Design a protein around this nucleic acid. Structure first.
Lengths: 178, 151, 50, 554, 234
RNA sequence: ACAAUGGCGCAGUGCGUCGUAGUCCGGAAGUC
RNA sequence: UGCCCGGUGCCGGAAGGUUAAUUGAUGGGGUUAGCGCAAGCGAAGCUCUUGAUCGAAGCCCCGGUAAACGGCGGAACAUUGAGCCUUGAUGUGUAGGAUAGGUGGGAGGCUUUGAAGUGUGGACGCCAGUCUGCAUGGAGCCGACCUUGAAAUACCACCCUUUAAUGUUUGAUG
RNA sequence: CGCGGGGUGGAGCAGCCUGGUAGCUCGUCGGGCUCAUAACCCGAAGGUCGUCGGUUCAAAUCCGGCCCCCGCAACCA
């Protein structure tokens, strides 16, 4: 709803004219954002994953994709095709929607956070980070969830450098209020 | 002691009705040496029975006294290097002494929220013959009936 | 072991059967398929199993 | 003829288990009252499913007399959820009621100007032959009054709200109006109350042409009970009589047989062991080692299910007050189930619950589990109390699911109550070896479907058990197992029974549902209630009423 | 139920008890063993092989026998409406619009033949299940309700007999009185036997008679060897 | 110490609270 | 001149288990008087097949045995089942206490006493009722019953079952 | 060289043909009963199942590969 527009006009031209590019397609556009929870819910309990699923589906408007283990591990017993966690890939609408909610409300509510963190880059231009306590989102509370989990995030973007990604991040609005 | 054994020593009366069966009843029920907190919950147990049931307060402990009272008991009698359990008929003096104790032990064991509550349960189940006190007695009965063979 | 031999009986055509195998180890259910009937000269549901 | 039913070399081969019935050759004659006995997996319910014609995938010939009507009564009847009157009228008098309705149309047609009088008079002949051939019919007040005398719920009541015995007693009363001549029936003693068991005993005992059932009660085996068909290696052994000393003899016949077989095998192994040292090998190395071991030396299978036994999960640690009911009242329409009922259950307490089928016992459970509310009065549970409910209605998702999967829910690791453990090892503590786990719910015996049921609902943790009719589907070695398990559990349970020993195990307290809105609570073992009952009886003796005649004799 | 009383034992001890005889001999015995009670009516109780449990034989019906049965040929019609509209010409003996069979517990018996109609039978007579302790109330079990009342009445007046098998194959039937001539009696007997041959057992063994028992309203009965195709009656 | 013959507050006692819980218990342990 | 009866051999016992010849019951099949244009159904008699019923020794089992082979570590009659009658007795799956199997006959009695009542002995917990011995009594109970039910029970055939007694027939043992 | 059995806590053994729980006796340890020591009572600890890897989802078990101890045979000349 909100961030979508602030991205098109203000953010995009700011990055353009820091790398002095002449094409507006050489500007990073966010591509997707992944919501993995895989804290082993389905290794000792099939329905705890069903739960976990529903909880990602409350913040995203629709059911998630159930993830699965890709080979045999001896030290955790599991096998290829075995459920073990759940993702929700977000492109478009739901990306925006989430992105907003997140930075705006959630990012203040991160433990002892008060500035900027833009040092975690893949090599291409892509950003990730974790979530220890899931209740930091505006619609997830402890007086709503049955027991608390974390989860983690993978922000993909058409950047070709970490100069690029690193700037993108700082050009967004962290307001320090609820 | 084997020479200077003696019987009961002067119990202090019931404050309310004056019965020295009730006097004993209270005595027994106390713990940590307080008659007050005892007799307090006792009268409460009587009232709740005489209320619910509708019966006199009198017959609420006197036909409870009759149905918890035993008639035979089980003596584990070692008789040399051998040992046999034998019955004998319980001594009249002891016979309702035992009764009143057991009605206090029954409510201590058999649950509910408070001891006056637990006892106003047993005071029913006494006189009806199914109670936790009733059980004790319907147990030393079976167990003097198998050993009836030896004596 | 030996995957069991059933004899799949017909009920709009032949009075006989076609012959095949199935795993009864994992199917207590009675087998049915469309197999071709020379008496009717048409394909048809075949039924019945061991 | 003498053969009312006859059997020629009948068998059944199940290659996962063992051969479950073999070479059954029996002849069933008029007047005989036969109980078919044996363990789970002895094939006793299957032998009756064969004679009823339900199961016909067998070797040999299972053959009924050509003029008999044959009645069969399963453990879970085919009555639809529909109403009591509608299901009672359905498979019995329908064929006669349709003939009586066409016969009324023919009456109406005799007064119609265009009806064909000659075809009306032939339809009337073929109708009156049907109504006479059937003989009985719906009638004005009979079946309806007979069902009320035999105390069944409302004629406008729903068959789906009706519990084990009632639903079976309707099914039976119906079945009997449909096919009388020979009775084939599937452990009829389990889940049918005192006045219904005394009724069943009387009826079976007076019966014509014959009776073939199953039982797990020592009173049945003394009163009905002319002949005993023992099933256990898949062979049938009819024995004429008798009394509970035969059961004791059977236990001693198997202990002798198992030990004599175990010695013959061991005896053979010492001779086999030397052989290598310097025989020629000759007939022993082939006949002994290859042929005898695995198949011939493998008779000890049925006796081994006795020491697999069974398990109940113990509680989560829990306080002194578990359940508090005060002045509870509950009714269904016009029928008062519960009225001013008060009790508190202490920790370590095992509460036995007695009285008729449909007295209101499951409706208490439903109020405790919040699927009902008190009409009047109150039910308060402790805060940390977790419930584990076991019904009469033991239905499930599908019949082609494995034992392990139905219990595990597709988990290798289960959180059983407050504690993690491997699922396969948990499912086995209910008597299930790896080949019995891999079998399907439709394949299983009732007694295996019983251990299966308990193994499933007990995974949520054994904190407060609400068990309705535990003995229901069980075979006697699974009955010993449940009892042994229960002797080691801590308690916090409210349990039903009808079985005297099982009652003796489950009381440290009694809830006796006596009459409409009369439910009595007493605190003690069933032996204590018994001494109290004998004291009431004493006083009842002097009082003149013909009520006391039933406590005296039948 | 009560069974074989002192009065029957003693009457039987005077002339004869439980044996089969030629039809001429039996009837002579029965006639004189009669006691009184009231002037001697003969009825016959015919045991044959039944496939009646499965209605694969007609031995519950009613047919006209050549001479008018009983002592008076007594007919009552339970009927209503457009069926006995067409018995206007012919005439029903007695019309019960609902209520007409009720005299029995006042010491009063009265019908040879109860004719019933399709509108009436649904009201009155449709519970044929129990009529106890006698079978006289009108029932589905002998069946054939009226297509018009007219023809049914004409048949009954002429001499129609209502017969059922009991339960196990005894077919009780009124032949007539003992005052009827040997030749008039013979005919009814012969008639009941051809009525059964028509209606054969299909696989109750081919037997149309087994044991013939014979009776009168008061005396004591005797059994016949054969009653139908042998010669004469008296 | 583990507790309502009690705990806390305004030996015993008067009120009021907590209602059987590892709690307003005890000072984690502990259910005598 | 000791220890071993688990093995192999044997002896003593058969309650149960398995079990021959014998016996040939039931089911199934063939034929076709006959039913039907009719498809197809099929009696009787004759056969083709299956093998209820009985049934032992052996064998499993139970008890012994090593101066057995060997091994000695790490024609009558008594009793008693069953097939037919014959002669009785309950006939209760819903009310109705129940004796309401079910149909026909059928409204008044000999059953020379059959009253019935009062009481005795047995039978049914349907012990109201009747069944069924014997004393008083040489005399009519009982049918709107009393009562419910759609139906009510006088009184004669008689139906089969649970079962009893006589006549038996038969199979067993002794 | 040729055949095969058994390696399970400190000792001596079960489990193993049915792969998902390592069970028993004695000793040991801690607490009691003795003035002290045996016995006795209560409670607990100790095991890569001789190993190495394999099929399997998973091996004390089923299958192989090494290190051991004990048996059988070594004969017609």
């Amino acid at each position: 709803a909100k961030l979508h527009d602030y991205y098109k006009d203000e953010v995009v031209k700011k990055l353009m004219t820091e790398f002095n590019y002449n094409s507006v397609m050489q500007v990073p556009r966010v591509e997707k954002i992944t919501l993995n929870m895989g804290v082993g819910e389905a290794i000792a309990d099939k329905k705890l994953l069903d739960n976990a699923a529903a909880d990602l589906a409350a913040i995203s408007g629709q059911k998630p994709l159930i993830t699965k283990a890709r080979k045999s591990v001896a030290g955790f017993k599991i096998r290829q095709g075995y459920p073990i966690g759940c993702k929700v890939t977000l492109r478009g609408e739901r990306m925006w929607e989430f992105f907003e909610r997140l930075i705006t409300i959630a990012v203040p509510r991160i433990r002892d956070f008060r500035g900027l963190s833009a040092k975690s880059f893949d090599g291409r231009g892509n950003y990730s980070m974790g979530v220890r306590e899931q209740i930091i989102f505006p619609e997830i509370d402890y007086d709503k969830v049955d027991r608390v989990r974390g989860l983690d995030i993978t922000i993909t973007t058409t950047a070709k450098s970490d100069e690029e990604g690193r700037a993108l991040l700082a050009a967004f609005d962290f307001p320090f209020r609820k | 002691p084997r020479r200077r054994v003696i019987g009961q020593r002067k119990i202090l009366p019931d404050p309310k009705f004056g019965s020295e069966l009730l006097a004993k009843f209270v005595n027994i029920l106390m713990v940590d040496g307080k008659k007050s907190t005892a007799e307090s919950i006792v009268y409460s147990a009587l009232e709740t029975l005489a209320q619910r049931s509708g019966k006199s307060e009198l017959e609420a402990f006197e036909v409870a006294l009759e149905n918890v009272r035993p008639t035979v008991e089980v003596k584990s009698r070692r008789v040399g290097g051998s040992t046999y359990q034998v019955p004998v008929e319980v001594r009249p003096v002891r016979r309702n002494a035992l009764a009143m104790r057991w009605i206090v032990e029954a409510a201590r064991k058999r649950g509910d929220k408070s001891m006056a509550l637990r006892l106003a349960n047993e005071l029913s189940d006494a006189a009806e013959n199914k109670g936790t006190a009733v059980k004790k007695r319907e147990d030393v009965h079976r167990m003097a009936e198998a050993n009836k063979a030896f004596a | 072991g030996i995957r069991e031999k059933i004899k799949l009986v017909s009920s709009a055509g032949t009075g006989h059967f076609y012959t095949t195998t199935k795993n009864k180890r994992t199917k207590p259910e009675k087998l049915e398929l469309k197999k071709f009937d020379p008496v009717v000269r048409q394909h048809v549901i075949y039924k019945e199993a061991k | 003829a003498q053969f009312v039913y006859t059997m020629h070399r009948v068998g059944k081969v199940v290659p996962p288990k063992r051969h479950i019935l073999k070479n059954i050759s029996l002849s069933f004659f008029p007047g005989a009252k036969i109980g078919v006995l044996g363990l789970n997996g002895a094939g006793k319910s299957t032998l009756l499913r064969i004679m009823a014609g339900i199961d016909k995938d067998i070797e040999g010939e299972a053959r009924p007399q050509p003029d008999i009507k044959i009645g069969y009564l399963p453990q879970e009847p085919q009555l639809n959820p529909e109403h009591t009157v509608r299901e009672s009228i359905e498979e019995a008098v329908s064929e006669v009621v349709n003939a009586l309705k066409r016969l009324d149309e023919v009456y109406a047609l005799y007064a119609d100007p265009d009806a064909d009088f000659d075809k009306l008079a032939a339809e009337q002949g073929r109708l009156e032959e049907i109504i006479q051939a059937h003989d009985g019919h719906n009638l004005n007040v009979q079946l309806e009054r007979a069902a009320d005398a035999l105390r069944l719920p409302d004629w406008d009541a729903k068959i789906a709200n009706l519990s084990g015995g009632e639903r079976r007693r309707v099914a039976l009363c119906r079945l009997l109006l449909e096919k009388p001549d020979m009775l084939l029936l599937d452990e009829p003693t389990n889940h049918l109350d005192a006045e219904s068991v005394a009724w069943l005993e009387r009826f079976l005992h007076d019966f014509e042409g014959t009776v073939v059932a199953i039982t797990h009660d020592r009173y049945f085996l003394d009163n009905v009970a002319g002949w005993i068909l023992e099933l256990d290696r898949g062979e049938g052994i009819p024995w004429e009589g008798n009394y509970s000393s035969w059961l004791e003899q059977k236990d001693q016949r198997l202990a002798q047989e198992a030990s004599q077989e175990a010695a013959r095998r061991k005896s053979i192994e010492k001779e086999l062991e030397w052989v290598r040292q310097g025989t020629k090998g000759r007939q022993s190395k082939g006949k002994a080692r290859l042929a005898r071991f695995e198949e011939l030396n493998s008779t000890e299978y049925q006796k081994r299910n006795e020491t697999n036994e069974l398990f109940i999960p113990p509680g989560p640690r829990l306080g002194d007050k578990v359940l508090e009911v005060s002045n509870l009242r509950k009714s269904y329409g016009d029928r008062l189930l519960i009225d001013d009922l008060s009790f508190s259950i202490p920790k370590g307490a095992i509460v036995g619950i007695i009285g008729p089928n449909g007295a209101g016992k499951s409706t208490l459970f439903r109020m405790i589990s919040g699927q009902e509310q008190p009409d009047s009065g109150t039910i308060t549970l402790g805060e940390t109390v977790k419930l584990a409910s076991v019904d009469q209605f033991r239905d499930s998702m599908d019949n082609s699911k494995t034992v392990w999967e139905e219990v595990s829910g597709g988990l290798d690791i289960m959180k059983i109550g407050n504690t993690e453990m491997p699922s396969r090892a948990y499912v086995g503590r209910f008597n299930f070896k790896g080949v019995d786990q891999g079998k399907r719910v439709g394949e299983l015996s009732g007694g295996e479907r019983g251990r299966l049921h308990l193994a499933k609902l007990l995974q949520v943790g054994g904190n407060m058990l609400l068990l309705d009719e535990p003995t229901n589907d069980l075979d006697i070695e699974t009955l010993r197992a449940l009892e042994n398990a229960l002797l080691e559990f801590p308690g916090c349970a409210m349990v039903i029974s009808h079985d005297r020993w099982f009652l003796d195990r489950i009381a440290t307290h009694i809830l006796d549902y006596q009459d409409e809105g009369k439910v009595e609570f007493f605190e003690g073992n069933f032996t204590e209630y018994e001494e109290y009952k004998k004291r009431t009886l004493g006083a009842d003796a002097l009082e003149p009423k013909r009520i006391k005649y039933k406590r005296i004799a039948k | 139920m009560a069974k074989l009383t002192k009065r029957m034992r003693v009457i039987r001890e005077k002339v004869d008890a439980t044996k089969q005889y030629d039809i001429n001999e039996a009837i002579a015995l029965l006639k004189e063993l009669a006691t009184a009670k009231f002037v001697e009516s003969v009825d016959v109780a015919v045991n044959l092989g039944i496939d009646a449990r499965k209605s694969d034989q007609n031995v519950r019906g009613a047919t006209v026998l050549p001479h008018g049965t009983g002592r008076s040929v007594r007919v009552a019609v339970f009927t209503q409406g457009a069926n006995a509209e067409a018995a206007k010409a012919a005439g029903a003996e007695l019309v019960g619009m609902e209520d007409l069979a009720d005299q029995i517990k006042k010491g009063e018996m009265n019908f040879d033949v109860v004719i019933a109609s399709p509108d009436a039978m649904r009201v009155v007579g449709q519970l044929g299940q129990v009529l106890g302790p006698r079978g006289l109330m009108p029932n589905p079990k002998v069946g054939t309700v009226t297509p018009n009342v007219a023809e049914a009445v004409k048949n009954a007046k002429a001499g129609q007999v209502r017969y059922r098998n009991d339960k196990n194959g005894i077919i009780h039937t009124t032949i007539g009185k003992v005052d009827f001539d040997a030749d008039k009696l013979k005919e009814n007997l012969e008639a009941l036997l051809v009525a059964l041959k028509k209606a054969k057992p299909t696989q109750a063994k081919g037997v149309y008679i087994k044991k013939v028992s014979i009776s009168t309203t008061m005396g004591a009965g005797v059994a016949v060897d054969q009653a139908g195709l042998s010669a004469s009656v008296n």
